């Protein structure tokens, strides 16, 4: 029989690393049906905040307005998604945006020629003033209660160095961007992960002994820290499977064609998660788990 | 024309690395693979986005209808 | 040795500052050399 208790006995997690952007960990004794659910929720269903509505007031630059709005929608914003609610689309445009669900960013930048530039200068930063527009130039314009709620943490891009646009003297950009909550299954700009995926733990079943110089070349067919030579007997053994990238270079030699079988542990998933910047990868994974549970609970409580 | 904000395949923000890539190519005498690795681009999907960018925006910008030439 | 190169720095420098003597692509002009030379031969050249 299968039971939640029998799953709780055998399931375990091995966090290999954890940063503010990337978290590498393991899920053991779980089914692909649930690991894939977690991965799909991380990529598509976990909400984040991105620029959606752009209100241009002037754009005399070479980049056209739709392209510039698309770029401004792509830049990730360091906003905690819980700090704002969801936009009610059915409401009219006047009352649709409010201080609890919309974040206003502005970008006003004019390019003027630098009258102190040296002769023979080819650097645009020395020839012109504001010849480059960066995501850091996206000022945050708090309105209403967010002037107090966001005082602890001002909204800035996760990558202020993103080169939004370039300018030349006389040219200018003046725009407002409205940032709301959305999910990545709608538009890829709301996806909060650079990439979240997994891979089964590789298995390297050595069938016959590889004693001798053959161990030197057999170990040469894998990533450096995967096969080792035993201190006692000159034998090859599997040190670390996680270090193996499955490239089957050993299979390309008929010497080992009947000495090793390459397989996988069909329940040992190595989740690698990277964050765009708005949330930590561990919190992304936690939110995906919670989303699956909450959607199941909504189905349970829905009348049939 | 101008560097893309994100990598097309995975979505990693690579729009803040074009100027650094040029700096590491010019000031440091780094080859393209070394510069891409030192920018943090490991997946070839992310490497291609910077390794193959053309940067036509600079050539577009020389035709300025708002300044005397 | 590398079979081909992207010439990133050279390309971006040339984009920034167009050459002041001649274009860097002579072959791109010999392609239209027939038409240019044919139109040139009717006003200049020997015999008037």
């Amino acid at each position: 029989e299968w039971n939640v208790e029998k799953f709780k006995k055998d399931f375990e997690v091995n966090i290999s690393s954890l940063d503010a952007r990337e978290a590498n960990f393991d899920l053991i004794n779980i089914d692909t049906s649930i690991a894939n659910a977690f991965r799909r929720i991380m990529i598509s269903e976990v909400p984040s905040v991105a620029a959606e509505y752009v209100y241009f007031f002037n754009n005399t630059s070479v980049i056209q307005d739709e392209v510039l709005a698309h770029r401004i929608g792509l830049v990730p914003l360091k906003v905690d998604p819980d700090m704002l609610t969801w936009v009610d689309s059915n409401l009219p445009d006047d009352e649709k945006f409010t201080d609890e669900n919309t974040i206003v960013l502005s970008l006003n930048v004019k390019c003027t020629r630098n009258p102190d530039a040296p002769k023979g200068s080819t650097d645009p930063k020395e020839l012109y003033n504001n010849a480059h527009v960066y995501a850091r130039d996206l000022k945050f314009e708090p309105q209403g209660r967010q002037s107090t709620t966001f005082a602890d943490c001002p909204v800035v891009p996760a990558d202020p160095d993103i080169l939004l646009a370039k300018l030349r003297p006389g040219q200018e950009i003046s725009l407002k961007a409205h940032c709301i909550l959305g999910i990545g299954g709608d538009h890829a700009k709301f996806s909060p992960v650079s990439t979240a995926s997994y891979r089964l733990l590789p298995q390297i079943n050595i069938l016959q002994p590889i004693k001798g110089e053959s161990a030197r070349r057999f170990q040469k067919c894998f990533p450096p820290g995967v096969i080792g030579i035993d201190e006692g007997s000159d034998e090859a053994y599997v040190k670390d499977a996680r270090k193996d990238t499955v490239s089957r270079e050993v299979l390309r030699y008929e010497e080992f064609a009947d000495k090793v079988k390459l397989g996988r542990v069909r329940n040992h998933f190595i989740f690698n998660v990277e964050s765009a910047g708005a949330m930590t990868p561990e919190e992304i994974f936690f939110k995906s788990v919670r989303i699956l549970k909450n959607k199941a609970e909504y189905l349970k409580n829905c009348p049939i | 024309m101008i560097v893309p904000v994100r990598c097309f395949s995975c979505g990693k923000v690579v729009g803040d690395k074009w100027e650094s890539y040029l700096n590491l190519l010019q000031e440091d005498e780094l080859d393209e693979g070394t510069a891409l690795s030192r920018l943090g681009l490991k997946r070839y999907c992310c490497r291609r986005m910077i390794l193959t960018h053309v940067d036509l925006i600079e050539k577009f910008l020389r035709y300025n209808p708002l300044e005397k030439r | 040795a590398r079979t081909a190169d992207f010439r990133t720095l050279e390309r971006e420098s040339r984009f920034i500052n167009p050459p002041k003597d001649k274009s860097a692509f002579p072959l791109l002009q010999e392609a239209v050399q027939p038409h240019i030379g044919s139109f040139n031969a009717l006003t200049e050249g020997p015999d008037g």
């Binding site: 990533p223 193996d244 990238t245 | 490991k42 | 040795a1 590398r2 079979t3």
Partner: peptide, 19 residues
């Protein structure tokens, strides 16, 4: 005929995720 010039300084670029 000279064979196609083998590029030099070829090192490992692919590593398992998290390493």
């Amino acid at each position: 005929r000279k064979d196609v010039p083998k590029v030099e300084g070829l090192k490992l670029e692919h590593f398992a995720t998290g390493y």
